[PDB]
Write a protein that binds this ligand. Structure first.
Ligand SMILES: O=P(O)(O)O[C@H]1[C@H](OP(=O)(O)O)[C@@H](OP(=O)(O)O)[C@H](OP(=O)(O)O)[C@@H](OP(=O)(O)O)[C@H]1OP(=O)(O)O
Ligand SMILES: O=P(O)(O)O[C@H]1[C@H](OP(=O)(O)O)[C@@H](OP(=O)(O)O)[C@H](OP(=O)(O)O)[C@@H](OP(=O)(O)O)[C@H]1OP(=O)(O)O
Ligand SMILES: O=P(O)(O)O[C@H]1[C@H](OP(=O)(O)O)[C@@H](OP(=O)(O)O)[C@H](OP(=O)(O)O)[C@@H](OP(=O)(O)O)[C@H]1OP(=O)(O)O
Ligand SMILES: [Zn+2]
Lengths: 318, 64
């Protein structure tokens, strides 16, 4: 199902990147531009976390210019079937801007670079300062929803989600023990040079990815002529999978991701779901911590968050 | 917060959008989905847990 396909997408993207390097050995125009385009996307994404609305809009325009150049394919890179990088195969749609059955590999490649850079900003910056996820998320949603970058009526955001599934599996319903090797692998516990990262580094990754997932799944397109490429139903579904876990299978990983999905995103959650969001917050921050057998600092942080919501924003989840 | 707090500022609920509803609305006529949401419509909160399918917008209110 979706799991299998996202794994296949993730490995198709690996081979695409290898094949871009192979092309550059025989394509001089590709060789002369490909590296600079990659570096300019990564640099621009890296400047979002430390910038204001106007500066961030400029970085977004820069990325859109590079992707526009890639789509025109003046470097004459090989073409590829984009169905290798979306969950469900797409057939032509009437009125769509781009119904071509093939896209330039340089274009797909740089979407992948863009998605990889966004993921890295969540991990490296939102892990310490979760507030920095929001501008990265805005940029992701703005770029992927650009009418010129839609393929057969919908965005290519499956390239980003395929990677999210790798690095934060709990957002997609996966569970495991932090005390077993198989469990750490199911939870996305990362490795650095073959050895498990520290628990503290693992929880920082989960914090940044929790906040980054919310940043891309809780965006407002009502006042925009663009379509939402990853709408809030996916936020609702992800939170539900976490908060319905049987008590024996609950891990601090889930609780850390959950706090990061929620904190600072309550107002947006309520805007989309109103009173249903209140009931879901009650489940996430009152019922879920109460029925967790191992009362950890991670479990307790969810309860403290409920207290703060009541003391600060005046929201009564009880 | 000591006194009454008003959360929703706009005048009335947001305009209808399918983006918050289930990807395929054919699931709302399933007995399973109806049962998950039955408790919410009645009591206004989740008892058996959070429904895995997001609500229809008609089931939500924004007057608080
Ligand atoms: O996530 P993994 O399955 O462990 O694979 C990683 C990952 O690539 P993916 O984007 O395909 O996941 C790294 O990317 P980041 O997470 O850092 O974005 C990439 O490193 P680069 O940053 O250099 O692209 C690295 O590739 P490499 O081994 O060439 O450094 C590659 O490892 P694999 O060789 O196992 O695919
Ligand atoms: O050559 P790789 O094994 O693929 O490693 C690269 C390389 O890192 P190191 O040379 O320091 O090991 C990149 O550095 P540059 O050559 O671009 O300067 C670094 O990029 P940043 O230093 O800009 O972060 C990138 O990491 P990232 O995933 O952030 O792009 C990292 O890739 P991996 O360690 O993930 O393989
Ligand atoms: O596509 P939208 O979601 O409606 O985004 C609009 C749109 O952006 P583009 O410049 O990319 O097209 C506006 O431009 P027009 O499409 O109407 O030409 C732009 O305003 P400008 O007219 O100044 O380009 C505005 O940006 P801003 O709110 O800063 O005026 C921006 O909104 P978002 O950046 O919030 O999506
Ligand atoms: Zn890397």
């Amino acid at each position: 199902g979706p799991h299998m396909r996202y794994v296949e997408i993730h490995r198709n993207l690996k081979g695409l990147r290898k094949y871009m390097a192979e092309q550059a050995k025989t394509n001089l125009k590709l060789k002369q531009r490909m590296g600079d385009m990659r570096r300019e996307i990564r640099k621009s994404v890296g400047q979002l976390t430390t910038g204001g609305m106007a500066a961030n809009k400029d970085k977004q325009q820069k990325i859109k210019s590079i992707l526009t150049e890639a789509l025109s394919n003046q470097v004459e890179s090989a073409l590829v079937d984009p169905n290798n990088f979306v969950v469900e195969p797409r057939k032509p749609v009437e009125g769509a801007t781009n119904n071509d059955p093939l896209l330039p590999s340089i274009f797909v490649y740089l979407i992948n670079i863009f998605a990889k850079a966004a993921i890295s900003q969540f991990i490296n910056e939102a892990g310490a300062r979760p507030e920095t996820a929001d501008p990265v998320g805005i940029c992701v949603a703005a770029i992927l929803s650009e009418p010129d970058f839609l393929w057969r009526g919908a965005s290519l955001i499956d390239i980003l989600i395929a990677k999210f599934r790798i690095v934060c599996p709990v957002l997609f319903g996966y569970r495991g023990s932090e005390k077993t090797e198989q469990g750490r692998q199911r939870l996305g516990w990362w490795k650095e040079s073959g050895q498990w990262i520290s628990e503290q580094q693992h929880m920082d990754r989960m914090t940044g990815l929790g906040a980054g997932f919310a940043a891309i799944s809780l965006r407002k397109f009502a006042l925009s002529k663009k379509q939402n490429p990853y709408p809030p139903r996916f936020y609702w579904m992800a939170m539900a999978k976490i908060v319905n876990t049987p008590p024996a299978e609950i891990s601090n990983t889930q609780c850390v991701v959950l706090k990061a999905m929620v904190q600072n995103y309550e107002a947006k959650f309520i805007e989309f779901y109103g009173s249903a969001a209140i009931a879901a917050l009650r489940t996430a921050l009152i019922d879920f911590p109460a029925r967790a057998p191992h009362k950890s600092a991670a479990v307790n942080s969810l309860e403290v968050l409920a207290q703060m919501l009541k003391r600060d924003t005046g929201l009564d989840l009880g | 917060d000591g006194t009454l707090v008003r959360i929703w500022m706009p005048d009335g609920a947001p305009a209808y959008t399918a983006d918050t509803e289930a990807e395929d609305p054919k699931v709302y006529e399933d007995e399973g989905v109806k049962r998950q949401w039955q408790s919410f419509l009645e009591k206004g909160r989740f008892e058996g847990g959070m429904p895995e399918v997001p609500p229809r917008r008609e089931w939500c209110v924004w007057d608080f």
